[PDB]
Design goal:
Largest sheet of chain A: 11 strands, mixed
Modified residues (Phosphotyrosine) (chain B): 17
Region (Dimerization arm) (chain B): 253-297
Order of helices and strands of chain A: EEEEHEHHEEEEHEEEHHHEHH
Distance between the termini of chain A: 11 Å
Oligomer: homodimer
Cytoplasmic side (chain B): 1-297
CATH superfamily of chain A: Mannitol-specific EII, Chain A
Number of domains of chain A: 1
Protein name (chain B): Band 3 anion transport protein
CATH class of chain A: Alpha Beta
Strand content of chain A: 25-35%
Region (Globular) (chain B): 26-239
């Protein structure tokens, strides 16, 4: 198995300092963090259509740093912003602000009650954190699973997903980093080395929920076939191919005014066949 | 004459065709038809592929309708359906009562919006006016194979549900006909959405209930485009209550796009997850229940 962490750039309430607070964690099954500061019940990950659309669009023109020689969040951020500017994903004037954001304090659930909670924020051109302009949507996962760690294998390597809003961006950008050697980072408190880093930054745009975008990226990384492909991927094209297979074997459930268990249980052959096709091209077998 | 005037997108007189009549609430029956070839005569014809009454039933290669099921959609289906809806050609409150008239007006509007070239019109009209056959004639037709329209593997649902009607239709029901075909002489896929001014019993396509809506989806073979699955997506969209009400009340393509984007906002994707199928599917029940709390209020 694997461990994945999702961190969203947010502001605290006491000092109004923007920072990184983890929002959800994955060990196959997804756990979510409530506003109280406790973890919600573990559940199978369900993704929204817009999140997967947006993830595919940003991954198609994404920035991959495979077998990367770094062992620090600062160094990984430096090389990532360098390859961002080289690919013209961000303007060079934004490197200072993006690097300032990436190396903030990465808080965890153990300091939520110590602080005054976290609120969504957008990075600005200056060093001051602003308030989002788009209408807000309280997390459906928070409303559903949160209102109420020994499973990690010793040899597993963690994955860190960072989602943040910065209004000084032309378009959302994705930087996917695989380290050559798994390293421990100050962002993750758990004693598991980090192998993959997802960095998803961009401006406030319609149909873009960066929490849902990070949830989609973390669910994709928690998928066994994409993880195995990512460990052996030597180019962005192979990761895009794995994402294409992931979307091919996905099941989209349209809305209906007659929700029923029996009607939903008629899709068992569909789910089994999609799993079979997903694991057909993989070296691994389904558990 | 000499002039070939370029179409001018104008909405100054658009509100002059917005009726004051509030549409009635009708349940929908949807029929998906595909462009196929029959082995007996090698003649192009339209064949029943699936129907929606309360659930989806697909037609197998034995003439027997498979097990009813919930209508699942592929990701590429909704992607491409949004793509063709954004540039779609809409004829809302069309004062037509025959398939020939609907097809002629739709092709004229296709040419007006630069969706098809004038040289494609005659072949598209020839295709749209072909014989519309039903599941009963299939056994007498000596089988059916899919076909592509030229200028001159089985579907997942069939393999999962088909290898092994009038009573169920509510009295005040209107039909939606979804026409799906492959035409290699088209540059891009085109979507034609038609709402008739009043429901009609088209002689060319006999249905259990009068037709109110027509979905026309044609195009060439393209990456990530399964036209059968695109027709399934359009039919599933029409079977949903909120989109059907919005389509009854729509006066422009933009309102239809807004309804479709809301439909996608309330759509849930299950990724490939190695959990057992029953638990993985039944976990969608509370998520769907919370997601659809406000949609049907």
């Amino acid at each position: 198995k694997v461990y994945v962490e999702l961190q969203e750039l947010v502001m605290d309430e006491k000092n109004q300092e923007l920072r990184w607070m983890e929002a959800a964690r994955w060990v196959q099954l997804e756990e979510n963090l409530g506003e109280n500061g406790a973890w919600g019940r573990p559940h199978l990950s369900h993704l929204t259509f817009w999140s997967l659309l947006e993830l595919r669009r940003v991954f198609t023109k994404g920035t991959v740093l495979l077998d990367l020689q770094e062992t620090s969040l600062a160094g990984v951020a430096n090389q990532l912003l360098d390859r961002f500017i080289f690919e013209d994903q961000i303007r060079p004037q934004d490197r200072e602000e993006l690097l300032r954001a990436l190396l903030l304090k990465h808080s965890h659930a153990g300091e939520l009650e110590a602080l005054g909670g976290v609120k969504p924020a957008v990075l600005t051109r200056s060093g001051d954190p602003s308030q989002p302009l788009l209408p807000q949507h309280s997390s459906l996962e928070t409303q559903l699973f949160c209102e109420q760690l020994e499973k990690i294998p010793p040899d597993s390597e963690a994955t860190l997903v960072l989602v943040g809003r910065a209004d000084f961006l032309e378009q959302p950008v994705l930087g996917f980093v695989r380290l050559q050697e798994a390293a421990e980072l100050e962002a993750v408190e758990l004693p598991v080395p980090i192998r993959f880093l997802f960095v998803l930054l961009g401006p406030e745009a319609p149909h873009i929920d960066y929490t849902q975008l990070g949830r989609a990226a973390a669910t994709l990384m928690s998928e066994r076939v994409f993880r195995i492909d990512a460990y052996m991927a030597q180019s962005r094209g192979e990761l895009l191919h794995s994402l294409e297979g992931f979307l091919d074997c996905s099941l989209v459930l349209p809305p209906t005014d007659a929700p029923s268990e029996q009607a939903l249980l008629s899709l068992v052959p569909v789910q089994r066949e999609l799993l079979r096709r997903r694991y057909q091209s993989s070296p691994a077998k389904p558990d």
